[PDB]
Design a protein around this ligand. Sequence first.
Ligand code: NI
Ligand SMILES: [Zn+2]
Length: 327
Amino acid sequence: QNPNCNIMIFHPTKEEFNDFDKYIAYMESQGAHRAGLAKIIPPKEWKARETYDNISEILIATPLQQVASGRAGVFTQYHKKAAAMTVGEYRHLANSKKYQTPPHQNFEDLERKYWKNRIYNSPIYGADISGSLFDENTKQWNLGHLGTIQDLLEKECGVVIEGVNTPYLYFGMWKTTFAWHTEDMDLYSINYLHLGEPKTWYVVPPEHGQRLERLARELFPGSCGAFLRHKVALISPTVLKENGIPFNRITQEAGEFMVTFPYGYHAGFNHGFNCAEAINFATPRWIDYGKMASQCSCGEARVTFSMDAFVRILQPERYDLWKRGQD
Ligand code: NI
Ligand SMILES: [Zn+2]
């Protein structure tokens, strides 16, 4: 299935939108994971929340200034602190003359601009906010409550990691950026754009993630032995074509879901003011990637959690063998 590793787009029926797990698995029987990313479009009736009133007076306690440096499509990005603000103020700042989305004829134009001018006017990302905009009544694809095996982490261990097993909110503006990464422990991620302007994703198929690693070692020489876990690298598509790294690019509109799959390297940016919600999740398929996830050796990035419970409970036949691989 899916021989060209293309980003597949699904339009589940209402019935198919009932069991989250079961549809993930169906997307995989059609080969979605081979691209490392898929778009899902919710049924017409489905809604995340009745209305987005009073999201104005919500508090972004610690927004981040994203300072890039480098050029010719290759940058390290670093995060610096900036003042607290309401979303009202952020919306307003993100539409001001300094941060607003530049005039552009089409996508190719916008992209050219983002990658040419990255180091200027460092944008402020309202990122990593612990919360959710989903209605409790929303029972299909509600990111607070997916009901996947990732929940084994909290029931077995009492282990809660923010943005991993509880959701994060992302208030974006033009040029706000996510560096090249696979998710923590190479988990799946799912992201819902709640509102506003689009988000662009670039994605490398899992089959080739190593090529991407290999390349990042040349572009940032002197580098854990798993550099990309720092999530500091920006690399433009031109630079990927130049070096023969397969990738795809897709632009997410408001109202749409993206799911990244284990070991699917991805990065991208926002086109303007927007608000996104995301969480990680897991399936039985992920366990083996979990146990395999290459961790940062220098300390700069976290070994997020222990695979122990997952193997013990869900792979009981292989558990003894897995322990002997340890200490
Ligand atoms: Ni991600
Ligand atoms: Zn490291």
